[PDB]
């Protein structure tokens, strides 16, 4: 019963319960001639909520805040964008206007600024080298190395063993390597194995786009990325 694009009308958001106090969020957007779904995370942070990633644009993001208040009813206080593309930072201006403090690595902030994308307000220290990990309330943030982008982060919720892979991780039904315009195809395989090694206890794995799975998504991602390289 995971929401798909055919079930989501233009500008609307669905929420999907992943575990106690962990939801994904799902919306759709026009991109490169097609309609794409994409995912984000919501994690209970004591009496508040922590948001991971926008819902891909200002409209979608506004709809996301309203859907949260309707379904959950605890305030969104902080948001983390896991890389610089619009499916992760587009809507940051709406979040800021809503009283949400926005965060990203310095590398993500640099790259977003240079692209003309929206720019999270605050810098996350402690993530600049591959294998670096920091706590951020109810989650761990991990920089596995360049892959889908050079700045890509992954997120682990240790209380639920949920691994959120963002666009560095592909869903099973994806056969290509996605948008590789800003990708490091050479390094991706190493970054993926670094994720496998750091999170062997993961039960749910959520890709940047499409259906959740388990640890198999990481091996699938490795395969798909190799297939592209010839």
Q: If you compute the radius of gyration of the chain from its CA atoms, what whole number of angstroms results?
A: 16
Question: Is 83 marked as binding a ligand?
Answer: yes
Catalytic residue among 86, 87, 151, 170: 87
Active site residue 209: no
Contact window for Zn ion (CB under 5 A) among 21-29, 48-56, 163-171, 190-198? 163-171
Output the six-digit token pair for 227.
Answer: 């297939």
Q: Minimum CB separation from Zn ion for residue 151, in Å?
A: 10
Q: Minimum CB separation from Zn ion for residue 206, in Å?
A: 12
Query: Which strand ranges, in their side-by-side order, compose the sheet holding 204-207?
Result: 132-136, 139-143, 154-157, 162-166, 204-207
Strands 48-52, 122-123: pairing is unpaired
Contact window for Zn ion (CB under 5 A) among 71-79, 87-95, 136-144, 188-196? 87-95
Contact window for Zn ion (CB under 5 A) among 46-54, 80-88, 135-143, 211-219? 80-88
> Largest Cα–Cα distance of the chain, in whole Å?
50
Interface with Zn ion (CB under 5 A), residue from 45, 87, 151, 171: 87
Active site residue 53: no
Report the candidate in 151, 172, 153 with the shortest Cα–Cα distance to residue 215.
Answer: 172
CA angle, corner 28, sides to 223 and 218, nearest 5? 20
Q: 72 near 61, Cβ under 8 Å?
A: no
Active site residue 83: yes
Q: 75 near 65, Cβ under 8 Å?
A: no
Q: Is the dihedral of CA 96, 101, 104, 106 positive or negative?
A: positive
41 binds Zn ion (CB under 5 A): no
Residue entry with tokens 């800003």:
182
- Count of residues engaged in binding Zn ion, rule: CB under 5 A: 4
State which of positions 200-219 bind Zn ion (CB under 5 A): 208
Question: Is 228 marked as binding a ligand?
Answer: no
Active site residue 148: yes
85 binds Zn ion (CB under 5 A): yes
Chain residues in the site for Zn ion (CB under 5 A): 85, 87, 167, 208
Residues annotated as catalytic are: 83, 85, 87, 148, 179
> Which residue ranges make up the annotated binding site for Zn(2+)?
83, 85, 87, 148
> Which residue ranges make up the annotated binding site?
83, 85, 87, 148
């Amino acid at each position: 019963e995971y929401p798909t694009v055919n079930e989501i009308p233009v500008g609307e958001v669905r929420l999907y319960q992943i575990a106690d106090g962990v939801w994904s969020h799902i919306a759709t957007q026009s991109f490169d001639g097609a309609v794409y779904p994409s995912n984000g995370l919501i994690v209970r942070d004591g009496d508040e909520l922590l948001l991971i990633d926008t819902a891909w644009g200002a409209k979608n993001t506004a709809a996301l805040l309203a859907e949260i208040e309707k379904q959950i009813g605890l305030p969104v206080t902080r948001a983390v964008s896991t890389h610089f593309h619009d499916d992760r930072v587009g809507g940051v201006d709406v979040l800021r206007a809503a009283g949400v403090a926005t965060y990203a690595s310095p590398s993500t902030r640099r790259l977003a600024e240079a692209e003309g994308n929206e720019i999270p307000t605050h810098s996350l220290e402690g993530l600049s080298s591959s294998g670096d990990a920091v706590r951020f309330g109810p989650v761990e943030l991990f920089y596995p190395g360049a892959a889908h982008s050079t700045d890509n982060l992954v997120v682990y919720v240790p209380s639920a063993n949920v691994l959120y892979g963002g666009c560095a991780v592909h869903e099973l039904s994806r056969t290509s390597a996605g948008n590789v315009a800003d990708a490091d195809l050479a390094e991706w395989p190493t970054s993926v194995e670094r994720i496998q090694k750091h999170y062997p206890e993961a039960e749910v794995v959520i890709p940047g786009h499409g259906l959740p799975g388990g640890l198999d998504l990481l091996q699938h991602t490795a395969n798909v990325v190799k297939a592209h390289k010839n």
